């Protein structure tokens, strides 16, 4: 309708610190919630 | 309710109240016909006394207290699969 590409333009994401590369792959919300659904599945089948 | 008696009492209700459906319900036998066969062989017992006719409606207490008859081959192979035989009770 009425919106700019400078508005919807881009929202990039930063990475893990190069000093904490021993513990790499910083966790984001999407990986967290997928970890959450998998852990909830395991919890539920353990309950069954 | 009173509609529960005016509507919900069924031949199916009294039929699931029947004994071999309760045996198949508590998984005494895998099938209801094998439950009937166990009833005929008298390998079961209903509280104090064992039973032989499938045409039996069981009171709720005896439903809690029904099982196999003692020193039966079926309960013995139960305890044999579970590897928990206790011949002291001629189990």
């Amino acid at each position: 309708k009425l919106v700019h590409d400078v508005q919807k333009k881009q929202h990039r994401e930063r990475s893990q610190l190069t000093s904490r590369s021993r513990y790499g792959f910083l966790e984001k919300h999407k990986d967290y919630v997928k970890r959450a659904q998998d852990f909830h599945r395991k919890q539920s089948t353990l309950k069954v | 309710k009173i509609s529960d008696l005016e509507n919900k009492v069924t031949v199916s209700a009294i039929c699931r109240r029947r004994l071999p459906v309760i045996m198949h319900r508590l998984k005494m036998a895998e099938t209801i016909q094998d439950a009937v066969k166990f009833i005929e062989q008298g390998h079961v017992r209903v509280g104090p006394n064992l039973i032989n006719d499938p045409a039996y409606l069981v009171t709720r207490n005896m439903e809690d207290y029904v099982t196999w008859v003692d020193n039966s081959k079926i309960k013995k192979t139960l305890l044999r699969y579970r590897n928990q035989i206790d011949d002291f009770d001629f189990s």
Binding site: - | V46, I51, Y56, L57, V58
Partner: protein, 44 residues
């Protein structure tokens, strides 16, 4: 009676079968005791 038949392990027969001077066989009393005798003095 029907439910006792269907849920009984032991034998149960029919309950019962469903003018003139008539006699009552079963007595709920020894039949020779006076009513005043069976009455308690407190209750009189």
């Amino acid at each position: 009676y029907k439910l006792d038949v269907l849920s009984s392990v032991h034998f149960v027969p029919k309950p019962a079968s469903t003018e003139t001077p008539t006699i009552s066989m079963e007595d709920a009393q020894p039949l020779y005791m006076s009513n005043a005798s069976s009455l308690a003095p407190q209750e009189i």
